[PDB]
Amino acid sequence: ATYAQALQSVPETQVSQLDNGLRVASEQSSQPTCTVGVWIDAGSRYESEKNNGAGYFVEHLAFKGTKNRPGNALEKEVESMGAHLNAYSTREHTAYYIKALSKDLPKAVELLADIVQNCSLEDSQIEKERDVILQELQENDTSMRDVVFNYLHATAFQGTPLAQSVEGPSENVRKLSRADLTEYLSRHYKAPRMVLAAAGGLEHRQLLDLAQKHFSGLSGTYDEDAVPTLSPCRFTGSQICHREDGLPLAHVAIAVEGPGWAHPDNVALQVANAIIGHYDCTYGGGAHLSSPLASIAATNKLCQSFQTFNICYADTGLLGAHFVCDHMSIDDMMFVLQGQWMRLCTSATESEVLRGKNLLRNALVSHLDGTTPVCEDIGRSLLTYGRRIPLAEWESRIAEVDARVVREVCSKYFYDQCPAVAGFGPIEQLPDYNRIRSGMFWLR
Amino acid sequence: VPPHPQDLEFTRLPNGLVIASLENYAPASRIGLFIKAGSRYENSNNLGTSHLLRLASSLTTKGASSFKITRGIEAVGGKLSVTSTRENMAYTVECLRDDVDILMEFLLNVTTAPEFRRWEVAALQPQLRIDKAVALQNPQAHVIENLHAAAYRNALANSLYCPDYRIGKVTPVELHDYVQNHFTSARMALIGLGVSHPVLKQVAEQFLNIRGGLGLSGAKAKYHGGEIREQNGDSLVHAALVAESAAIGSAEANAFSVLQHVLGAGPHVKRGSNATSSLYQAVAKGVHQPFDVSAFNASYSDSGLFGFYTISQAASAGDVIKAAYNQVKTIAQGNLSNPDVQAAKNKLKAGYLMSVESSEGFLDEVGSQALAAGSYTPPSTVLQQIDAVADADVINAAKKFVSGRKSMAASGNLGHTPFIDEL
């Protein structure tokens, strides 16, 4: 057997839909444990200037006692049954999920339905989670990796929903009332906007019975209004420079406007970002690394780390890169990075593009190993792409990409485009925006 | 549609090398060569030699240059890792299904036929100061080094990271010799995933036949009692207190492993209050601060450690360690209902099944057993092994902790953090 056959022989994901609106999806395997969860089109982009931080609080309060299982009864019941419970909030996607034994599937689906539908929101507990979030916002303040990314969003998508942090400003956290949380819940947490994903050793029929028996209690449309639909966010080429010499290493994040979840170009952009690659000072290869930026950065010791990212949203995103370096290495790192973008736009060898494809080929198969990443992939895919995309379809789009496609696509999104730049730390060397903007096209 | 699960095949060569492949029909492959080589098999003289060897995996080999190893693996989208424990070194390659023989070739070249060039090793010397300093940001790491150092005498007291004075002093001859001594047939074990067995066996016969001194077995994990207390000036006060548990092979290991889950093993609910955790609830009722405590359990093929780890403020450490210690002593005296054990067993056996879920953890578990015993025992028998642990074994394990010699390690502002004799 070969890689192309293995992709085809992979278990086919299956999806059913309840009458009340909920989508229910599953990936069957021969393993004994499983992951099952609930994915929701909810987060910071849906939030507004009044109720920014609602999705975070709700996540904070979610796993504290439900209306039928109070205090820490839910917590005790999940823990005692030998399973894990987890949650997160993306700017566009909130999600709760349980990792458990396959045997435990019915109870897991019930406790998920219990968390979502009938949440308590105890007033004494809101006042405690208020302090917890106020602690956690100071915990994020020290993390320079997160601060520079929140700034990148704030300046890339300035004056729009995407500029907002998922956690929200400290003032909103201090003044967020129960009325706001419950109204945010009643609006956004609903069946047609939700997906129930599962993955492991479990039968699709059974999951659909559990979803029908527990989740069909959710409402299926609106009050004829109150249906919020995403207005597109304006990308703005701009800079934010939090000058702070006291901190040890400068963090820079530069990006151009992204494609959006729907765009086929994403594949060629993933190949593109794989060619430039990513580096950390703990890497083995160093001077002999394939991606010239890493090789140059390793030999000269320009930076501690860099990583090319493609953050995606509904109709836009952030395509670019991130690096952490000494205060005297910012201009050089920036010069090599932009040099690599411009190079890839104008000249791209067939060999390095094949390496770029193979890195991405390996990335897809590496990532979907274990049940939790596959359950995430399902739950995310149905909210973003609409359907689950098979690995064969991905491979078709990777094999589609050759050198000319990478050049046509890189040059489309990068060449002569104003990039959103975010700098935090000892950033006196960080090049002027006109010089950065001059670097976004070439001498040619 | 559900696909059929295939048996994990198993072969043990005449020269002593353990082989195991699992035909997954997966898109990716996942191959590992596990070796009884690690921090313990260093000695008084040649320290940090496993650490530099762990780092040096991409250096020039006899069949392939350092450039060829890096670029050849990267060009097929693959990746070559090394994962050291105190006992075992796990050289692992990952790639697509059509690029197996290539990564295998490099894997064998690195593990059987490395050159260790004087200039390349000399060039690599400062990387282990970095790699150490990176990991030592996690204060857990340094407390555990100090714990093992103070707990044992010679064998497992060896630090996993290189001693600071040995930075730069590790020779290319010491690496040569450390490989020649330990990277051998009876000590090695080749594991495979997403690959056919016959080719993996034939490669293991053709290339992996080399044998030298040592020949499996080992020395002695001479257990001792010690306390090293590093004054830190940190935000928190990280500490740990253990005693000699059982070695991995016996049912006592499973009793200690259950006792870990009876006590506060580690949280399951995101942003929870640690409900079913025993130790967390014992300390929470006592002192009212930001803290964390958990049950620490190390088990090796020779020996093992068991106890708990405490994180706290300056003054709180005194109360937190005592209250946690007393909660171990209340279990040790015998206050333990049957549902507590039956939950803990369910937590453990679920956690085990979850640990073998991802192919990386699976391969590490197959490679663990291939060295530890020289066999494979599938999950169901491990589930039976857990479920068969009596309540008496849990009370005896908890009692062995309190009765046995103590080993402590703490780092922070330790002004109100007790000694072992003060317990």
Binding site: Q135, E136, T282 | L55, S84, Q140, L160, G266, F291, D292
Partner: peptide, 30 residues
């Protein structure tokens, strides 16, 4: 590293295990 919520789980789950690689960042598991 400020509250009790985040501080949960940081206590040593198992003996530390150092992983270094060609591609992947160097980690210290448990």
């Amino acid at each position: 590293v400020l509250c009790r919520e985040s501080l949960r789980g940081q206590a040593a789950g198992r003996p530390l295990v150092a992983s270094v690689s060609l591609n992947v960042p160097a980690s210290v598991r448990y």
